[PDB]
Swiss-Prot record, chains A, B, C, D, E, F:
The lineage of its organism: Eukaryota, Metazoa, Chordata, Craniata, Vertebrata. It comes from Homo sapiens. Sumoylated with SUMO1, SUMO2 and SUMO3, which may regulate the level of functional Cx43 gap junctions at the plasma membrane. May be desumoylated by SENP1 or SENP2. One of its GO terms (molecular function) is efflux transmembrane transporter activity. This is Gap junction alpha-1 protein. There is a cross-link at K200 (Glycyl lysine isopeptide (Lys-Gly) (interchain with G-Cter in SUMO)). Its main location: membrane. The chain crosses the membrane at residues 23-43, 76-96, 119-139, 171-191. The keyword Ribonucleoprotein does not apply. Residues 44-75, 140-170 are extracellular.
Length: 201, 201, 201, 201, 201, 201
């Protein structure tokens, strides 16, 4: 029966959000980590053992795989989802340590404090999301070609290198882009609702 | 002893369903995720390491494996079962946050609201199921041939490529098709029963 | 202390069985899933990486491994044990949803109903078991030869192909057959006892 | 606080054993499954990928690995420990279903029954242990030679085949033999104590 | 409801820290072990199977991989995070065994003791962090070159050896360096706050 | 709230130890199993697939890997830590079964007994530790050379064989030696304190 304090914590954390925003954000988060856990990581299993180039020079395959992928997409999405999940955990720990000290002060004695940090966290989530989307557009684009051309030393003039299952990776890149855009739009919607409520006093 | 609130939640979520529909849907769901977890994924383990073609041109195997399978069947079924399980979780979160706020309003004060979302979710499950069945029929069919012919650059004119255990994959494709059809039929049956009860007022 | 309702559920589910049948069926089930989880699946690990044929024609190994094993024994036994465990779970969910609604009706108001479904489930278990035993006898037999002969296109006239550890697979096939026969005999014994009690009125 | 019924169950199951026998049997069981889980199974990982023979005939390696090991030692010990752990679980389930029905009969009404099954189980454990020890002595012996000679078709007259890490497997075989003998001796000691107490009336 | 004693323990352990230091240290710790568990270890999977050298002399690859990496970065960071997490666990166990004995002494009878060990632990964390940073700078630097030159016996005069994905490892090395510096700065901040409070008496 | 009996058990087991010995032994144990679980076992992954010799004779690599490593270091440390953790579990089970029977005898009736077994267990831990250290010194030493010379049949006169990452294994061997010596010193310290208290009567 020790679940009422968790209910008061879930009340105090989601005090300012819309009743529609909470369910969609939670379901989208569970969807994101389940998709990244089950289907996506098994598709990038042999991302280097199947990468073959058309040459005989020893060491050309490693440097051409270097120049093709500066960072894999899976660890990119892991870093992105961790950086997005950090400020909600910071808000959670802050609200928990406020509630304990406040109950202490109230057992002794028988807006602008908590709203501001909520605004800061919901700003930082959108800022991190748009930063990661811009970096992913600048580095890779939103497709993968089946034939890559490599011009790095110590290979000869130009060699051809062939990727590994690029169609499936293009499909999953499009899915992660759609999920990212939906998350950004929902956070912007929550910001707009809170600042629309705030002007009516 | 903190299980009565979960009993009230299980009462309020399944308020409109048939007593026969609930047990068959739950057992079918457990059957589906257990079959997809244990037997199916281990059969698609070496779907690229055993794919051999009859050529010497370097890079023909990767592009012919590309043209053979635009997306693997396992991640297809994972995406399908996640898209089917999403609206039930949305209904669950909606009903939970209704019940908490309603108990708050009732502790303060000592059809068409919840039925409509139920109709929306049970429509969306069938729509997603028939969409995934049509896409799987359009892309792959419902069999796998042991010999595939490939006509993609930079290979020569036509090469032969041989798949990996296609009989077992055909058997499991037929099982997943049967499970999909049974799920669609049961959801249509539940819709028909609810709309048959609704006209008697 | 929230375990008495599970005790009433375990009372109401096993109301008609023999006191000797329940312990042997439960211990046999735990034995079956433990044997299938630990020892059996690790023996079928390299069922294709060690399958070698005596030829040079590219693609003969895949089609001869196809013709040798239409479906692996491990996923066969997984499908068999899932199809056997399904009707007991259906009976469990039915009895649980009967008990909740009956306690509701009793809190409002301060044979042939449940026996028939029990008979149906204990019929369906034996029917599924004898069906799977007949299919396994018709497809594979109950042994594995160390030398297999293959006559499929695009190989030449006849090639020899050598299996991977067939002695150990023969031993485990005999164990699974013995477990299957013991399960069928015990379910027939329970049916005979219940129909022998039923005629005395 | 729902742990007193488990205490009464642990009282009623170990009613007849020595106070020294219980701790040594339980610690030996935990020792056995921990040793078989952590250290032993990782040593038999590459038991076929490292088995090389001195020939060029295709298919000689599979049949010589067949003739060398009819069944691997790891699955042998798994089968042995499962067959040894079965009768204690049968006694547990029997005593539990006796206790529930007896408490029912006692809530209604406000040696030779349980001793015999205990004697049967503690006989069957020793019988299964000595059977498995005799079979392991008859098939393999208690050592592994580094050089094996093979005389099976379709190889030529005699080929040499070299095993994989036989020293470490000899050490672990000696450890499992010592553990087996200690288990048999302790069960014989418990039988002797119970039959020594039984004659004094 | 057995969570109040853990609340008193969490009160007594964090008695002297800043309200801002605790949330940032806990979130940084969870961030560190999650990053080291998910993304980092999968990038160092094939750190030896993809390391190729430009030679024919057998045994040059093993000794050049030896001279390139005296210790892998992953096990280095594991050792570092374990050595950093040790003194907090020592403080935890000390405070727990103080609290139990003190409650015993208080049930019998119906600064400088605990502050000093806190100062010792928060000194030792910073000392271990700066030691590991200095060793990592002295051995490897903070980058990885794609081409390594090897001059060890029994190779000839000088051979070229090519690493495996050095760009991604450079990125993750920079991330771990940034996390290390942030941890050191926060521990120095907590030391400065406690010694700034201590002089005001 | 069912945690007070575990508190009485933790009181009765650690009744004779020093307040400083318990925290250091528990933290050292957690340190040992965490280091052996995470970092050490992944370093010994390819201990045979990367072991190459300078020869053409088939079967020389297996017998030279045999003569190099009679038993791997990982399973050696697993056996050592299990043999060290056994007598504490024996003492735990003995004290638990004493406490239950003593509470039974006390509910009926409304030094030299427990100290001796504690002395026996804390003797046996040190004896097993010094035995394992002497065996590890006698077999392997405390280093690993990068070049090993092999003189076993059926190889020719003398071949050279090259190990796999010996520097990292030397570092981890030194760490395990340091942990072993610290454990032995702490157990000797606890013995000395208890026998120093015992003479004052």
């Amino acid at each position: 029966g020790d679940w009422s304090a968790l209910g008061k914590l879930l009340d105090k954390v989601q005090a300012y959000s819309t009743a529609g925003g909470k369910v969609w954000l939670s379901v989208l988060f569970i969807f994101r980590i389940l998709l990244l856990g089950t289907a996506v990581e098994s598709a990038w299993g042999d991302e280097q053992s199947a990468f073959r180039c058309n040459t005989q020079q020893p060491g050309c395959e490693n440097v051409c795989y270097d120049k093709s992928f500066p960072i894999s997409h899976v660890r990119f999405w892991v870093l992105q989802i961790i950086f997005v999940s950090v400020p909600t955990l910071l808000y959670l720990a802050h609200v928990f340590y406020v509630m304990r000290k406040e109950e202490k002060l109230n057992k002794k004695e028988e807006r602008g404090g908590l709203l501001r940090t909520y605004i800061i966290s919901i700003l930082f989530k959108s800022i991190f999301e748009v930063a990661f989307l811009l970096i992913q557009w600048y580095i890779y684009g939103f497709s993968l070609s089946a034939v890559y051309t490599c011009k790095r030393d110590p290979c000869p003039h130009q060699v051809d290198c062939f990727l590994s299952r690029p169609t499936e990776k293009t499909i999953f890149i499009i899915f992660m882009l759609v999920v990212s855009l939906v998350s950004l739009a929902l956070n912007i919607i929550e910001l707009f609702y809170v600042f629309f409520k705030g002007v009516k006093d």
